[PDB]
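A reminder before we start the practical. When you read a complex entry, don't treat the lines as separate problems. The point of joint prediction is that each chain is placed relative to the others, so the output describes one connected object in space. Small molecules and nucleic acid strands, if listed, are placed in the same frame. In the example below there are five entries. Take a minute to note the order of the lines before looking further.
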Amino acid sequence: KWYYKTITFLPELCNNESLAAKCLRVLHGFNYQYETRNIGVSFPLWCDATVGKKISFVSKNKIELDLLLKQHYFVQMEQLQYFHISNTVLVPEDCTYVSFRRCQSIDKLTAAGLARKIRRLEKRALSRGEQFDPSSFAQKEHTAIAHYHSLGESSKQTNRNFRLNIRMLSEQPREGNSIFSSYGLSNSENSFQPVPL
Amino acid sequence: KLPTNLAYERSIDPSDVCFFVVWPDDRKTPLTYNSRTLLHQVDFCHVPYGASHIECSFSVSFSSELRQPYKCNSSKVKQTLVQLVELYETKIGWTELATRYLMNICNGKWLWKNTRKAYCWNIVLTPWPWNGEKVGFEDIRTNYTSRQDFKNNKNWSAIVEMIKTAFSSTDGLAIFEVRATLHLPTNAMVRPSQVFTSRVFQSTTIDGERSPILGAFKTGAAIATIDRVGRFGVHREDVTCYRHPSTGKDFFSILQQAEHYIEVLSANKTPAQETINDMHFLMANLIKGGMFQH
Amino acid sequence: VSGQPIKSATAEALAQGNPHQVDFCHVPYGASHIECSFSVSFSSELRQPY
Amino acid sequence: GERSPILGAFKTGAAIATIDDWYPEATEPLRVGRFGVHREDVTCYRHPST
RNA sequence: CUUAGAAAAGUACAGCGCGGCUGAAAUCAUCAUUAAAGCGGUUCACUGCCGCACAGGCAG
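Here is the predicted structure of the whole assembly.
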């Protein structure tokens, strides 16, 4: 059975985008330093102009989640009056299930991503065929996209600041796998596991 | 002193700058930009992958429309200004203004920030009337970086001469057609003019498709940046304006000394520190044109 | 008017930007030459007053 | 179906009628009018006092 | 501390018949809106993988 604990960004003068990015960073770190990927991440509240003031971690295993929220970052921010932590609350039956899927489409929709796509096609052209001309490919005159937050991230193996984005959408209230990617994302390559508010 | 009606017409007439993309086959296609909107409009313009070099072309035409005022309520100030122009031309000459206006054409100042991270960019122009080969400048970044570097060109004296004749003789006219070649890095940012209203560019349809553009007025500002020449020394980035009316070196506080300047230009050798610079500013404002009604 | 500078004309006020809206007409890129045509007629209506 | 800039009919008439160079101290032609009005200079020649 | 002190106007009702505004017209000559203009990303959305994909998915 799912269990969750929540934390609220107490200061009013703060970028909750940056705070959520740091939270996802420590979450990913724990998901590697340890092999488990049980715990997902959910935002109880979401606004079209900014991510919510609270972030709630949802996991099928209680012990793993509690051990995760004992990480050094959380402890050293707790006594600084910048974080407020809830111990644990069982998932209510009245909660709703939505998925915070990460969107890889924007990384290709952007201009440098389009250039990367064309370069990848050029490299994959080693599969024998007539040499294509880049002049044929062109960018769309107009592009319309739904609301997203694009929290932000920095790679550790190499100094590349790739920015991750998540789009919220409702899904079927049942999925028993309880698996996620390196970060809680509800867009795991295997399946799009929902998370509760 | 200022008559109720006094208007001048611009002598320098820049045109729009149209960007072209050159492919390795040397075929040219108009540059295009993407527009992104959220459900606020943000516009992105980058060099497509595989493009050889961006090409920008525009035409600037000089004319002798500063000889006499376009409109003039009173005849006295009309002949005053005409005599002032004649005396300045005869005593100081158009060489300084011509060189300052021509350097911005040749050094790529009109490209604004588009030349920031380009490896090398060339400026080649075909003047009119002309009787030989096109004037060509190669690798402005390293070769032509100073007045001496420009003057050491093969025919720098010839091109600057036709501007002097155009400014001096009535009906005289010189037309240039500039063509820049920018070897920008792969998928480098191109910064065109943004329309008055977020980031949204000015666009004109070329060959059936929209293209980013640099406004004609915006290019004129870069060509006329010789001091930007204006009634007051207005600075765009830092809000404060130099040549404030309190400083006594604006256009009007200088224009109203026309009789004194006429006396000075004809009596003895003018000082190169104060009077010559004031004369340069006055004629630079006259070339720009405008209305000096009140 | 015919006097000292207005006191309120500080550095910022005289250097602010005042927008304008004009109609811009120019020859399109890639054209060859502009062509203009009209018709004028000469008549003998000056012989007798209207 | 496309709006296009034009030169007014009265304006082109004002152009081909700029033949008047018979005023007392004439230098350049003017538009033929009952009071020989100059436009580049505001004042008008051929005043009734003349 | 009021020309103070007090007071139910109410019952019925058919305006009806008929009608030709018609003749005529010229609004009407002339006209120059013209001059002059920077709206500005310093970094920020990168680089790999799969798939034949101007398809759509992966990770750091």
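Discuss with your neighbour: Residues 8, 10-15, 31, 33, 39 of chain D lie near RNA strand E (CB under 10 Å from a C1'). What might explain this?
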